[PDB]
Amino acid sequence: FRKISRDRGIIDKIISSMAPSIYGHRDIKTAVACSLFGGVPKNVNGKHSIRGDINVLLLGDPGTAKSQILKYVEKTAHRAVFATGQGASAVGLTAS
Amino acid sequence: MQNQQEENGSEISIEKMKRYITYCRLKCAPRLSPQAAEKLSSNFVTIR
Ligand SMILES: Nc1ncnc2c1ncn2[C@@H]1O[C@H](COP(=O)(O)OP(=O)(O)OP(O)(O)=S)[C@@H](O)[C@H]1O
Numbered sequence: 210f211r212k213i214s215r216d217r218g219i220i221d222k223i224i225s226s227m228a229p230s231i232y233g234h235r236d237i238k239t240a241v242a243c244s245l246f247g248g249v250p251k252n253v254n255g256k257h258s259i260r261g262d263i264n265v266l267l268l269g270d271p272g273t274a275k276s277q278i279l280k281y282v283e284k285t286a287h288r289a290v291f292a293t294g295q296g297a298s299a300v301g302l303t304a305s
Numbered sequence: 306m307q308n309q310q311e312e313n314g315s316e317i318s319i320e321k322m323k324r325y326i327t328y329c330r331l332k333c334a335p336r337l338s339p340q341a342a343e344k345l346s347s348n349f350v351t352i353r
Pocket residue numbers: 230231232233234270271272273274275276277278
């Protein structure tokens with residue numbers, strides 16, 4: 210990890226490593242990498258709390274391979290939970 | 306800087322505020338002085 214991190218163009222490689230089955234959506238891959246890696250979430254003096262993880266919205270026309278990117282993030286992430294709004298055979302978003 | 310202000314006394318901690326709020330709500334309930342009602346009346350009627 211340390212030997213591969215000290216390369217200057219490591220970040221680009223990570224952007225090249227996101228979703229090899231998806232072609233040409235470089236900004237979406239950059240956003241996916243930022244969401245997977247994430248920032249630090251902080252709580253200054255206890256009183257104020259700043260969120261530290263990136264939320265990404267992939268808005269797109271049909272046939273733009275957003276779902277395949279979501280499955281790639283499911284395969285890649287340590288704890289990835291998939292949910293859907295219209296579908297039924299999935300874990301819900303509502304606590305019960 | 307917030308820790309410095311808390312040590313100096315210009316700010317208090319959140320738990321100290323919580324216990325102080327509980328103490329003040331439990332102990333104190335003021336009344337308007339008779340001299341303080343006339344100005345309240347005058348200001349309330351000038352606006353209307
Ligand atoms: N840039 C791309 N690279 C590779 N495959 C792509 C690309 N764009 C579309 N596809 C393919 O086109 C199909 C679209 O599938 P989906 O990911 O389900 O589409 P979608 O983005 O979810 O849009 P919906 O489902 O109509 S809302 C898949 O077979 C993808 O592999």
